[PDB]
Amino acid sequence: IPEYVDWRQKGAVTPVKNQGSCGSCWAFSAVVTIEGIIKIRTGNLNEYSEQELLDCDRRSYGCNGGYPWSALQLVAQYGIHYRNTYPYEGVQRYCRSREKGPYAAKTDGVRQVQPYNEGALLYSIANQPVSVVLEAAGKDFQLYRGGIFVGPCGNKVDHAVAAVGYGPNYILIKNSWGTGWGENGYIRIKRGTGNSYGVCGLYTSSFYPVKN
Numbered sequence: 001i002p003e004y005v006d007w008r009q010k011g012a013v014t015p016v017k018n019q020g021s022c023g024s025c026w027a028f029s030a031v032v033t034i035e036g037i038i039k040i041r042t043g044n045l046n047e048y049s050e051q052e053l054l055d056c057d058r059r060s061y062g063c064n065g066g067y068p069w070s071a072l073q074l075v076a077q078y079g080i081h082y083r084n085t086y087p088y089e090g091v092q093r094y095c096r097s098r099e100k101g102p103y104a105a106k107t108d109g110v111r112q113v114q115p116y117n118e119g120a121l122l123y124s125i126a127n128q129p130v131s132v133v134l135e136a137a138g139k140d141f142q143l144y145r146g147g148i149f150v151g152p153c154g155n156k157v158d159h160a161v162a163a164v165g166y167g168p169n170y171i172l173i174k175n176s177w178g179t180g181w182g183e184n185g186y187i188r189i190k191r192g193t194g195n196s197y198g199v200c201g202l203y204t205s206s207f208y209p210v211k212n
């Protein structure tokens with residue numbers, strides 16, 4: 001795998017989104033990985049529905065949080081609609097996937113990166129955007145404006161985001177806090193520290209969709 005990956009440069013990343021107050025990061029993270037794998041496999045970059053996962057993932061708890069793995073398993077089992085078909089409302093509502101016609105995309109499964117293993121995560125990022133989790137509760141992360149983020153942070157992971165690239169010192173993260181946070185909505189998080197957890201627990205729980 002190469003020294004640099006940046007799926008934005010491959011046209012595989014949609015604009016940065018803002019989840020708002022709803023604890024829907026798990027769905028945004030999942031959606032980033034679906035948009036990416038659909039671009040990688042088909043050549044078209046589309047936006048898909050975080051709201052659909054929020055409403056329809058019966059293992060998640062809506063705006064009270066959820067599981068990126070559950071959302072990706074939902075897109076592989078049923079599918080997902082375009083974002084314009086099922087727009088983001090920032091609140092869990094009834095599942096309306098039935099009422100919006102056939103799905104726009106469907107994946108074939110979900111694979112987990114071997115946790116606590118930087119190279120395994122880098123290998124998955126070289127192939128596609130990856131859903132990852134991290135500790136975002138610290139003010140250092142909350143107030144991050146730019147640069148390669150080194151913390152301070154613990155590994156108490158609480159926030160799902162998406163890894164869309166990396167470099168020699170960093171992993172490139174698409175957050176769902178709008179375009180005014182970080183580096184136009186992105187954060188570069190230090191890697192190569194020898195901490196199995198990753199900076200901010202970045203290697204704790206990482207998933208990506210599989211699409212044949």
Ligand SMILES: *[C@@H](C(=O)O)[C@H](O)C(=O)N[C@@H](CC(C)C)C(=O)NCCCCNC(N)=[NH2+]
Nearest residue numbers: 023024025026061064065066133158159160
């Ligand atoms: C993410 C966010 O919007 O910042 C949101 O809080 C979330 O999904 N958190 C996850 C933790 C990370 C994805 C690792 C979470 O808490 N998942 C477990 C389910 C939520 C807690 N349980 C209930 N019943 N609400």
